[PDB]
Structures are given as structure tokens and as C-alpha cells.
Amino acid sequence: LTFTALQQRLDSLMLRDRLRFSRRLHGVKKVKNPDAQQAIFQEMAKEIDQAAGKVLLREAARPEITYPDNLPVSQKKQDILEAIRDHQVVIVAGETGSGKTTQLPKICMELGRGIKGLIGHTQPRRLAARTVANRIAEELKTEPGGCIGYKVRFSNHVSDNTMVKLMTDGILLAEIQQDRLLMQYDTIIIDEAHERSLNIDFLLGYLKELLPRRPDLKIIITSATIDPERFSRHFNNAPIIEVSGRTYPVEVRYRPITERDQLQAIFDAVDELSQESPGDILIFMSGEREIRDTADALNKLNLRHTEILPLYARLSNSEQNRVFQSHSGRRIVLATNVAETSLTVPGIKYVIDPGTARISRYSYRTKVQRLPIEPISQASANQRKGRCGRVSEGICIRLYSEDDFLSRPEFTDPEILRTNLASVILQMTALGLGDIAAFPFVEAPDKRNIQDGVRLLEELGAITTDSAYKLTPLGRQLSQLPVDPRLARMVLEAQKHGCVREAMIITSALSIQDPRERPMDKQQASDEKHRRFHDKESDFLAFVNLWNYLGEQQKALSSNAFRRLCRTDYLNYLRVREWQDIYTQLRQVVKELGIPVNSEPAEYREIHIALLTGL
Amino acid sequence: QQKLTFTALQQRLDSLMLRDRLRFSRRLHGVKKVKNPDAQQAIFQEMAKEIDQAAGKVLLREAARPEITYPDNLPVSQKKQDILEAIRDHQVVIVAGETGSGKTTQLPKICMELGRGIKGLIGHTQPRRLAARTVANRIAEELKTEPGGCIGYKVRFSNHVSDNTMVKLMTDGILLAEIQQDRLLMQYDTIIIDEAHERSLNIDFLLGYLKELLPRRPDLKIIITSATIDPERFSRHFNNAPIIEVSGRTYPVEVRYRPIVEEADDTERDQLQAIFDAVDELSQESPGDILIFMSGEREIRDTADALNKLNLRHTEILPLYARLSNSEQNRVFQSHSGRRIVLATNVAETSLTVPGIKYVIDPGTARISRYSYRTKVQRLPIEPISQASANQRKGRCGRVSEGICIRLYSEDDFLSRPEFTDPEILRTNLASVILQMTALGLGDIAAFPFVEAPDKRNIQDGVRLLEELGAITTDEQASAYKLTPLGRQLSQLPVDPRLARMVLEAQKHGCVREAMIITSALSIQDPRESDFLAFVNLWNYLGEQQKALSSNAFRRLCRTDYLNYLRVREWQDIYTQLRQVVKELGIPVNSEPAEYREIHIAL
DNA sequence: CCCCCCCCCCC
DNA sequence: CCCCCCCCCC
Ligand SMILES: Nc1ncnc2c1ncn2[C@@H]1O[C@H](COP(=O)(O)OP(=O)(O)O)[C@@H](O)[C@H]1O
Ligand SMILES: Nc1ncnc2c1ncn2[C@@H]1O[C@H](COP(=O)(O)OP(=O)(O)O)[C@@H](O)[C@H]1O
Ligand SMILES: [Mg+2]
Ligand SMILES: [Mg+2]
């Protein structure tokens, strides 16, 4: 055998099984003569035979590929297939429900990819990674973990036959450290890319950097039809395949805006839509507790021939399946913005859009990364509207004016432009992504804030530069707390004083806009109402007192009597619920990390010492 | 800033986790070979900063150490100081006691109270992944902590751990898989081998490797936890390690022998009527729940169906299935008004603690893996349990006095049984054993420190079959056997090696369904290559007729035929468990029957 | 200027 | 014949 017969048979082997051999033959031409590297040429070919056997095993295990006929991606798959075949990067943009997420991996398989390497397929959320993987496996009549596997936090079903591997973008970023060239994959699908989270942008930057060193790798950026040109120019003017099928125009009804109920507008819209022809209603909510209160309210009403279905992140597998079951009458679906573009709620014809969303945004006033509930962008509101366009005569009720909509900015800020650089640097450092200033971002953060973010991380003990940024074990712990680094540092210090509960209450409060209102009209009853929670020692302790006051009285009152209590005590109902959501999410993360949380409230003595760590 | 030395830096390694201490120690050993003292100093100055960094991981873990409490009612809780002192002062301890003592849930706490679990993890093995997850959830609950925190678990497909995990529940197979990336098991300062009396290949492999390992791991402590079945064998293995017997008071159980009268003349009705007669006999006794042992889940379903047709007064029939919901999985520990009859397999013999059981009914059988020399196949027959097992089943109604275990066989039948179950190592074909050791890197089978070595006359035969199948290959000086890609795929199939090769070959041709049909039929006794087609066609016919008529009407069909419904049921049972294993390995199975003679080329 | 591998493996 | 240190690499 010659050097060419062994080099060219590697192109049949797996990607990982071609690296250890192709640059392995170069060692054979080095020790300075043959007749010992002519018998090694014969014996390393035995290993090349056994390698190609696993390729044939994977081929023998590939299922027959089928597609639902009713999906635009199914109908248009030939154009998509030729675009993927002929370009290293393709932007696939299409209306929600076109079949991008469930059919794109199949098209990659039909094209022959996924044998010599895996087709990695990222999602923003673990629930979507798992749910998508079950669905494709089922469409192909396979078991999850066979041809279609998945890898999320706490759950990893990827066998030796797996060709498509669903995962969260977070999961894919964490694998770079161990596999700098991502050699496990021949194809990578970045899905829901229009969310422009830090994770997505981290992947888009890293992949663009990686491409020159991976001529065999193919990239498919999959997203809603929202300024996809930006993805295109980033990947050196990669083609954009717009895969939207037929969509019908949607009627937009504007329903803008002392004892009026907070949810009264939603009740009105619900009753109005109930008078329309059959079709389910999708209601966009700002969070889980808002969805809970709204489901409880709508049930109290006993809407005739109407069933209420709240989409919680904590929904069991039994509940998630009822979303796609046939149902008798009219169904009202309550969801956060996950069903905006990511989820595909079936049977939807009418939408109620309060117009707000929880979004991560750094406050220069408070010096804190926060989660303001602010009006959504036009592009975001148009996605919510678009969910009615699957059929004709869809109705979208917007709980705001037309002037308001026209005024709102066109697009949503990508997370990279609304996050303090300390958080960004910490994640990059934790992921081994390199120096923030040389990273090929799609859109770069403000370079003038890099030094401030580096100093903060040092002052917090998160990194070691006294050049060569390294995480400290404390820093590794901060990077896993999804709140502002300064606030998270305080939480980590509270565990040494047995007041993590209070640290999380205070952190939660500081991560939102002040729930204590003070309108122009009264300006005195609001002040006297909130003075019931002043603490002589610190402004922060007022939040703990207000927190304990709120907890006791959601127990003494019903869900409806509570909302009256909020406007009775000049408290923002939505912000209170958000305060409760964030604390719950934070408490679950903290406890999963083994950080001790005090059961009984720790007195205001040890809370002082722990507070004086942040700044 | 100032001069550092080997002595100073080495003294700081002891503030570190054993992993870090080992690494830095070997890094310092290298610096002893550096001829340039300036270079040594520079390395020291750098290494000292990293030691400072690494020592912080210990402080974070200490900050997460939970407060330890013990249920007052448990014998292990009541003897915790004696247990704690034995663990402290010995490198290996054998903790043996009746089921329900609190060995599984309280031992990991005891190690944490000793101070272990910080510089290394307390690994805790189980034979079943469900047990590993369930125990970790339980201890975490008892400690008022979230699973994945200080108490975590790692099983196939589900890893709930964190940087602060101190106790790590896992299957013994998970621990064995970790050996080839950590030969010293430096992740752990403590390893608890639970249910050790089951004497599976996995357990014996761990006991063998642990015994080899201990001289290289003076900072490691081992706790062998088992039922009270010949624990002196474990003691002798680990150089006469002390045995701490943690049972509470012993409450003798009354044994009634009720050999099955062949009154109906039907083997399946005759057994059901024996269970009915046992249930009657027991309901004439003081209040108490009944635990009926079964050999499979198909048997549980049929027997539970039968007992319900009886219209029993104020009695609930609770079947225990492996795939039970976490809702139905909870009710077994909850209060009930009347009498409850619980049907379970031998998972309820020693591993599980079904509460409130005063009476036991024991048919005396279980599925056991045993290599048949006649057929040259590793079979999974139902066979009479050992005396040790039947006493374990009897023990499960001895929580208080006046327990009654009814044995559906005679005393002579009981005495004819062997004193102990054969350990798996002594009833498994050597080809499977050698394959499994080679996949794990456990070394030559003739030098492995087995608790009980297999008969070495079979070793060369096993190597031959594994060479013929293409699972292994010998190399440079015929000193170590090495695995091939095919053999690794064979390592993952819990069936006979020759049958396993067939399953993989069926994957090429889309007839893994048929390969499983043949495989499960060969691992049992028939209800009756051209012979294998009879297996498939019988299977297909039975499946169709099973969906055609009711469950009751289907039993009438088997008896109006030269077919035994019991063997049919065990065939379907084995197949189902086989299909579950195949699916978890990502091997595709055809839905429709493979077309004719598509299997010929696969045999 | 320290640590470890193959028949994809480590101090 | 083939690679590595922030526990990495043909
Ligand atoms: N798990 C599921 N069960 C039933 N139907 C589903 C499931 N997932 C997706 N679908 C349906 O398949 C269609 C395609 O959805 P998807 O592939 O997510 O499209 P896109 O990613 O373009 O929004 C949708 O209309 C949806 O209703
Ligand atoms: N999952 C569980 N739910 C509720 N109680 C349990 C659970 N597991 C164990 N227990 C209680 O703890 C006791 C101790 O059981 P265990 O620690 O498994 O003892 P052993 O391992 O010695 O059989 C049991 O008898 C039971 O009362
Ligand atoms: Mg999608
Ligand atoms: Mg136990």
C-alpha cells in the first residue's frame, strides 16, 4: 500500500477517526527510512478497516427519511437540500410553523450528513431540546436516543448510532473546552437564532472563527424572518433561504389600557374572541405566576365550552402532550414568549397580546443587570400577531394603542448590547472563549466598558489577573448564578453567614423595577403605605419586610383578593409576581448547587456582615 | 516573593482534594528532575498560586456541608456511633443487617459526620439505576436538601451532581466504567458497595478491583453493605475486615408450608388457587398487609388481575412495577384504610422496604442467569430460589412479632434447595466474563482477585469464542487481550455472546425484532436454522390472536392448542425486557415483522 | 519552566 | 505511526 491509498480511504472514516490517521501518516514519513514504515503501513490499515466498519454500522442504522406533506419545509426541501449541499453556511429563515426545527435535521440526513459526524442542533431551552428530539424520533418511527438523541442538563441520551443530537446552545458552548475543533459534528444547526442571546452570539462568533479550520463542517443558522441579512453578512454573505409557506393577513384590534382589575383587559378580550368562529386563543403572559393567576381567574368564570391550558416550564410530560391533542370546543392557551416563535401551539387563530415581556437589561441608574418588564419591539409584536396567520381571518387583539405600536423600536436589542461587560467576560472566561476584544462578535459590546468589567470581576474574586484571565473556584460559582455578578457575589457570601434566603430576596428585588408605586395623584397614601416596611438599618432590609408581608397575605387572601391588595397597597401586581418568579427560580438554582438556604429567617444581625461584600 | 521549597509546598497538598493533591504531588516530583534551580523556583511560585486556588474548592465544599440528622426509629441510627467508630478506625468494614435497618439511607450520612465527602466523594453503588436515583432523592429529602446538591446521583442517561456533591449514588456499573479514566478512583475518599450480597459480576468485579486498589489508596475507605448472608466471605476477602451487624431485635417468623395441590390439574390455575388459599388463611389472622413475591411483571399483572376479580373485602391490590409512575411509586409508602396486598418481584427481597408488611406469600421462584451446557447458551430460567433467598423473603414480614410467611412448597422442597445462591461469576459463561473484564480494563482473568474464581478450565474456550466472533485480538507478546470495535458493541448487550453477535447482525437487515424473538425464546423453555423460523411464526401468530380477543379469551386459545400459556407469558416477558435494553443502546427495531428469509442471511 | 497516555489513550 | 494542561490531546 502507498501513502495515497491509505490517505484517501480516510475520507470514508468518521471525522474523529480521520484526524488520528491523516496526521498520523505524517509521522510515518518522518523517521528516516522505509521497510519499517512499510510494515506499519500494512498494520495500521487493519485499524482503518475496523474504523470504516463503524461508518457502515451507522449507515445500516439510518432510518428511512419521511416528511409531513403539510409543512412548507417538507414541500421546499429540495431547494434547502441543494443550498446546504453547496454552501458551508446557510441561513434558513421562515415563519413559525414552517417545519424548520423538526424537518431541517432530516434534510441534513437525506443529504448524507450525520454519518461521519453528528448533526448538532441547539435550542435556547432544555425543554425544547428534549421535546424536539422526541418528535423527530417519533416522526421517523425511531426511539429517542437512537438516530435522534439529545443532551441537556441532567439528561443525556446519545448512543453510538445517534446521527442528530439536540441540545441547548449552552450545552454546545460547554463542549468547546473539551473539543476545540468540535470534531464530534459534521453539521451544526443554531436554532431560534433570532433570539440573539449571549449563548447564540457566542456560538455564532466561535463558529465563524472555527470555519477556516473545519472545511468539512456545515453550519445552518435557523431563525424567524427577522433581519436575517445580518446573519448573512456575518458569515461572508451566506445564502438566505426564506421557507415561509402561505400566510393570511391578520386583523389587528387595538384595545389600549381607579379600581379597575389588572387582568380586566384580558377578560374583555377573551369574551370578545369567544364570540368569533371556532379557533383557539393564545394569550401572551409575562411570567409563570401571572399565567397561574390568569388560569385561576378564567376558570372561576366557567367560560362555556372553553378549557384553559397554561404552558408552564414545569409542565409534566402528561400535560405537554395535551397541547397537541384534539380537543372538543374552544381552548385558551396561556404562555410566555416561548410560544412566540419557539413553541408552535396548534389550532391557534386568535391572539391576545398584552405587549410586554421580561428582558435582561443593565441599568446604569442602579448598576445592576435587571429584568425589566418593558414593551416589546415591533418585530416581537409582529411575531405574536403572525401566529394567527396560519389560517384566514385570524384576529390579534393588542392591549395597547396603534400610536404606541408605531412608536416602539423596530427590532429587539440583542443581549450582547444590553448586558454589563462583567457578566459577558465571566461567561466567556468560564467557557474558554478567549479575549473579549478579539472575539468575532456579530455585534460587538462597547469596548470602552471592558476594563470596568475586568476590574469588577477582579474585585469580586471571580478571576485571576493578579493578561491571562483565569476563573477562580469562586468565579466558577458566580458564573452559575443567573443574576448580576455583584448580587451573586453577595449571595455566595451569605452562605457563610446563614442568610442566603434573605440574600435571594434582596437580590430578587434589586433585579426588577421597584414594585412600590408612588403615583402623581395620591403621593401621600403611597408613601404611608410603603413606610410600613422601612428598616432603620438598611434600605435593603425593607425588601425583606415587604417580602414577609406579601407572603403572609397571599395566604390570608384568595388570588383575586390578593390583586386588590396590590392596588390597595400601591404595589405593582406584575412586579410582585415577577419578584416571586425570580426568587423561586433563584432558590431552585441555589439549592441545586448545594448552597445552604436558611429555613427560618436569619435575624438582621448576620445580614449586615454578608451585605458588606458587594460594594 | 520569597523562597519556596519542596517540603513547604508538599505540606500544603494536604489542604486539597485528593485529586488535586495527587496531581500537584506528581508535578512536584517532576520539579525534582529540573536541574535549573531558578526554573524550580519559578515553577514553585506559579504552583503555589494554583495550590492557593485549588484549596478554595475545599472551602466551598465545606460551606455546603449539611447538618446531619437520623431517624430515631432505625437500628442504624441507634448504632451510629459504633458504625462511625468502625469506619473511622478501619479501612474496610462489612456492615450487615436485615432489610429495613437503615443501611442504605443512613450509612452515607455517617461518613459525612466522620468528615468524609469533602476532600473526596462518598461513592455509593446500587445494582439498579432506579435504586440509585431513589436513594439519592431520599437522603437529600431527609437532609432537607435538593438532589444534586450535597447528595447527588449518576446513572445511565441522568447525571444529577454538582461541584458540591459529597455523596454520589450510582450503579455499580457506572463506577466500573469510571475506572478506565481514573484508575486510583481519586474522585472518591469513600466507596459504599450496596446490596453486595447479590454477588453479581459487577459487584465481584468491584470487590476484586477494590482489594487490588487499597494498597495504592491509603486515604480510601471501603464499606461493604449487604444482607445477613455469609458476610464472613466478604470479611475474609478483605483480610478479615470487621463485621458490624446492624439489625435490631429479631422477631421470629412463623413458616407455613403449603405445597401447591394440583387440584385443577392446570399449572397456572393451580398456582393462582394456592395464592387464593394463602390469602384466605392469612385474612383469618390479626390485621396486616400481605407481600406476595413474583418472578416477573407479567406474572404480577395476571395475579393482580386475578385477585381483583375476587371482590375482596376492604382490600387493595397494589402491584409494584419497575416502570411505575412516580405517583403510584409514592402510594406504596402512604397510609391506607383497610388491608393492602402488595405484589412484587425480588426487588422487594432485600433492596426495597415495603412498609407495613406483616405476612408474606412466597412461590419460591425467580429469574436467574445460568449458563446451560446442553444448549451452550446463557439462559434466564425461572428456578427455585436458594434457602438464603427464601429466608430473606421470609424476613420481610419480621418487622414486629407474629409475622407469618406462607411458602407455596413443602419443607422437603425448601431443604432440597442449596444453602446459598450461586454467585453470578460461577454461573456465567467465561466468554461473557472475559469480554466484560476486557471492556473495563480489569486485566487478566487468571490474576484477578475474585471473591470466588470461575473454573479456569473454561478460560481458553471463552477466548476462542471471543476471537471467533471478532471481539478480541492478542498483540505484541501475547501478554494482554485487546478489544475490537465489534467486541465493544458486544460488551453492551446483556445476552449470550453468540446471540449478541446475531442481534448486531440483525441490525444490518432490519430484523432486530426477529433476533430478539429468537434470543428470548432460547433463554427460556419453549411452549412446544429452520427451527428458528418456527419461533418467529409462533410469535407472530400469538401476537395477532392476542390483539384479536380479550385477555380472558386469549387464555382459552392457548389451552385449545398444544401451547402453554405460562411459557408464552415468560417468552413475552423476556422479550420485552430485551427490547428495553436494545432501545437504550440506540439499536433500531422493526415495527412490522421482517419479510420472509430476510433473516436467513442474518443467521 | 513541573504532570500523563494509545492500538481515542493520561499524570 | 499520532497528540495535550486553566484536568489538557493526534
Ligand atoms: N411535539 C409535537 N407534537 C405534535 N406536533 C408538532 C410537535 N412539534 C411540532 N409540531 C407541529 O409541526 C409543525 C412544525 O413545527 P416546527 O418544526 O417547530 O416549525 P418551525 O420551527 O418552523 O416553527 C408545527 O405546525 C407544529 O404544530
Ligand atoms: N424512598 C423512601 N420513602 C420513604 N421512606 C423510606 C424510603 N426509603 C427508606 N425509607 C425508610 O427508611 C428505612 C430504612 O431503609 P434503608 O435505609 O433502605 O434500610 P436497609 O438498606 O438496611 O434496608 C425504611 O425501612 C423505610 O422506613
Ligand atoms: Mg423553530
Ligand atoms: Mg439497602
The neighbour count for residue A11, using CB atoms within 10 Å, is 10
User: Distance of alpha carbon B266 from its chain centroid, rounded?
Assistant: 35
Concatenating the DSSP letter of every residue in B229-249 gives S-HHHHHHHTTS--EEE----
Does B391 lie in the same domain as B516? no
Please give, rounded to a whole number of angstroms, the shortest distance from the CA of B379 to a CA of chain A: 27
Of B229, B238, B293, the C-alpha closest to B99 is B229
Does A181 lie in the same domain as A214? yes
Give the 3-state secondary structure of residue A370: strand
Mark yes or no for CB contact A61/B160 under 8 Å.
no
Phi, psi of A244 (to 5 degrees): -55, 135
Greatest alpha-carbon span in chain B: 94
Sign of CA dihedral B83, B87, B89, B91: positive
Nearest residue of chain A to residue B475 (CA atoms): A43
Of B298, B257, B280, B415, the C-alpha closest to B339 is B280
Q: Tell me how far the alpha carbon of residue A104 lies from the centroid of ligand 3, in angstroms.
A: 10
Contact B175, B191 (CB under 8 A): yes
In a domain, B480, yes or no: yes
How many Å apart are CA B377 and CA B58, to the nearest integer? 51
Contact A500, A491 (CB under 8 A): yes
Phi, psi of A442 (to 5 degrees): -60, -50
Atom of ligand 2 at shortest range from CA of B103: 22
Q: For the packed helices B551-559 and B565-584, what is the interaxial angle rounded to 10 degrees?
A: 120
Give the 3-state secondary structure of residue A392: coil
How many Å apart are CA B388 and CA B601, to the nearest integer? 46
Does B557 lie in the same domain as B455? yes
Contacts of B283 (CB under 8 A, 6+ apart): B339
Phi, psi of B474 (to 5 degrees): -90, 155
How many Å apart are CA A216 and CA A225, to the nearest integer? 27
Q: Tell me how far the alpha carbon of residue B328 lies from the centroid of ligand 4, in angstroms.
A: 21
Query: Best residue in A66, A130, A140, A143 to probe B by mutation, most B CBs within 10 Å?
Result: A143
Nearest nt to the CA of A16 via C1' is C8
The neighbour count for residue B341, using CB atoms within 10 Å, is 24
The angle at the Cα of A480, spanning A613 to B63, to the nearest 5 degrees, equals 55
Does A135 lie in the same domain as A150? yes
How many Å apart are CA B142 and CA B138, to the nearest integer? 6
Q: Say which of B60, B158, B587 has its CB closest to residue A154.
A: B158
Greatest alpha-carbon span in chain A: 97
| Numbers of helices and strands, H then E, in chain A | 26, 20
What does chain B come to in residues?
603
Query: Best residue in B164, B473, B491 to probe A by mutation, most A CBs within 10 Å?
Result: B164
Q: Say which of B57, B146, B586 has its CB closest to residue A591.
A: B146
Q: Tell me how far the alpha carbon of residue A101 lies from the centroid of ligand 3, in angstroms.
A: 4
Residues 129-158 of chain B whose Cβ lies under 8 A from any Cβ of chain A? 144-146, 148-150, 157-158
Of A459, A460, A454, A466, the C-alpha closest to A429 is A454
Does A165 lie in the same domain as A119? yes
- Measured between beta carbons, the chain A residues lying within 8 angstroms of B122 are none
In a domain, A89, yes or no: yes
In a domain, A397, yes or no: yes
**Shortest-distance Cα residue to atom 4 of ligand 2:** B333
> Chain C: nucleotides under 7 Å from a protein CB?
1-4, 6-11
DSSP 8-state secondary structure symbol assigned to residue A516:
B
In a domain, B1, yes or no: no
Of A474, A452, A470, the C-alpha closest to A461 is A474
CATH number of the domain bearing residue B495 = 1.20.120.1080
Last residue of a domain, one of A382, A415, A448: A415
In a domain, A192, yes or no: yes
How many Å apart are CA B602 and CA B504, to the nearest integer? 9
**Shortest-distance Cα residue to atom 8 of ligand 1:** A135
Last residue of a domain, one of B369, B396, B422: B422
Contact B24, B11 (CB under 8 A): no
**If you search the block for the grid coordinates 379557533, which residue do you land on?**
A279
Contact A197, A124 (CB under 8 A): yes
Q: Which residues pair with B371 in a beta bridge?
A: B378
In a domain, B68, yes or no: no
Q: Which helix (H) or strand (E) holds A139?
A: helix A126-139
Nearest nt to the CA of B181 via C1' is C10
How many Å apart are CA B552 and CA B269, to the nearest integer? 13
Contact A222, A96 (CB under 8 A): no
* List of E strands, B328-368: 339-344, 357-362, 365-367
Contact A190, A92 (CB under 8 A): no
Q: Which helix (H) or strand (E) holds B318?
A: strand B315-319
Does B208 lie in the same domain as B81? yes
Sign of CA dihedral B377, B382, B384, B389: positive
How many Å apart are CA A397 and CA A350, to the nearest integer? 8
Distance in angstroms: CA B49, C1' C2: 14
Mark yes or no for CB contact A476/B591 under 8 Å.
no
Q: What cell does A191 get?
A: 436554532
Contacts of A194 (CB under 8 A, 6+ apart): A223, A224, A226, A227, A228, A341
Of A513, A583, A517, the C-alpha closest to A548 is A583
Report the half-sphere exposure of B588 (CA within 13 A, side-chain side): 28
Contact A156, B159 (CB under 8 A): yes
A61: contact with B, CB 8 A cutoff: yes
Report the half-sphere exposure of B256 (CA within 13 A, side-chain side): 16
The angle at the Cα of A268, spanning A267 to A273, to the nearest 5 degrees, equals 100
Of B554, B560, B582, B564, the C-alpha closest to B525 is B564
Residue type, B536: V
Ligand 2 lined by B353 (C-beta under 6 Å): yes
B513: contact with A, CB 8 A cutoff: no
Of A366, A132, A349, A341, the C-alpha closest to A244 is A341
Atom of ligand 1 at shortest range from CA of A135: 1
A258 is in an annotated binding site: no
The neighbour count for residue A240, using CB atoms within 10 Å, is 18
Nearest residue of chain B to residue A144 (CA atoms): B586
Number of folded domains that form chain A: 4
In a domain, A67, yes or no: no
One-letter-per-residue 3-state SS of B533-584: HHHHHHHHHHHHHHHHCCHHHHHHHHHCCCCCHHHHHHHHHHHHHHHHHHHH
A479: contact with B, CB 8 A cutoff: no
Does A312 lie in the same domain as A258? yes
Last residue of a domain, one of A381, A415, A449: A415
User: Distance of alpha carbon B78 from its chain centroid, rounded?
Assistant: 28
Ligand 2 lined by B101 (C-beta under 6 Å): yes
Per-residue b or e along A25-63, where b marks 16 or more CB atoms closer than 10 Å to that residue's CB:
beebeeeeeeeebeeebeebeeebeebebbeebbeebbb
Both ends of chain A: CA-CA distance in Å?
70
A355 is in an annotated binding site: no
CATH number of the domain bearing residue B391 = 3.40.50.300
Sign of CA dihedral A12, A16, A21, A26: positive
B528: contact with A, CB 8 A cutoff: no
Q: Known binding site for ATP: residues of B?
A: 97-104
**Shortest-distance Cα residue to atom 25 of ligand 1:** A97
CB A16 within 7 Å, strand C: yes
- Measured between beta carbons, the chain A residues lying within 8 angstroms of B586 are 61, 143, 145-147, 149, 159-162
Does A568 lie in the same domain as A444? yes
Strands A89-93 vs A218-223: parallel, antiparallel or unpaired: parallel
How many Å apart are CA B567 and CA B561, to the nearest integer? 13
In Å, what is the CA distance from A472 to each residue of A426, A481, A543, A589, B28? 11, 15, 31, 20, 22
Atom of ligand 2 at shortest range from CA of B350: 23
A208 is in an annotated binding site: no
Pocket of ligand 1 (CB under 6 A): A 71, 94, 96-103, 131, 135, 324, 344, 346
Contact A161, B489 (CB under 8 A): no
How many Å apart are CA B305 and CA B317, to the nearest integer? 9
Does B193 lie in the same domain as B238? yes
Burial status of residue B254 (CB atoms within 10 A of its CB: 0-12, 13-18, 19 or more)? middle
Q: Tell me how far the alpha carbon of residue A7 lies from the centroid of ligand 1, in angstroms.
A: 43
The angle at the Cα of A300, spanning A299 to A303, to the nearest 5 degrees, equals 60
**If you search the block for the grid coordinates 392457548, which residue do you land on?**
B558
Does B270 lie in the same domain as B150? no
How many Å apart are CA A174 and CA A162, to the nearest integer? 20
The protein residues having their C-beta less than 5 angstroms from ligand 4 (an ion) are B 104
How many Å apart are CA A577 and CA A566, to the nearest integer? 10
Does B496 lie in the same domain as B523? yes
Contact B139, B158 (CB under 8 A): no
How many Å apart are CA A564 and CA A501, to the nearest integer? 27
What does chain A come to in residues?
615
Per-residue b or e along A144-154, where b marks 16 or more CB atoms closer than 10 Å to that residue's CB:
bbbbbbbbbbe
Report the half-sphere exposure of A335 (CA within 13 A, side-chain side): 22
Task: Select from A102, A131, A247, A327 the residue to mutate for testing ligand 1; criterion: most ligand atoms less than 8 Å from CB.
Answer: A102
Give the 3-state secondary structure of residue B362: strand
Does A358 lie in the same domain as A273? yes
Contact B423, B384 (CB under 8 A): no
Distance in angstroms: CA B209, C1' C3: 25
Contact A541, A555 (CB under 8 A): no
Report the half-sphere exposure of A212 (CA within 13 A, side-chain side): 3
Q: What cell does A378 get?
A: 415591533
Distance in angstroms: CA B180, C1' C4: 14
How many Å apart are CA A314 and CA A319, to the nearest integer? 10
In a domain, A309, yes or no: yes
The residue range of the domain holding A205 is: 72-242
Contact A329, A306 (CB under 8 A): yes
DSSP 8-state secondary structure symbol assigned to residue A212:
G
Q: Which residues pair with B125 in a beta bridge?
A: B170, B193
Phi, psi of A361 (to 5 degrees): -150, 130
Q: What cell does A5 get?
A: 491509498
| Numbers of helices and strands, H then E, in chain B | 23, 20
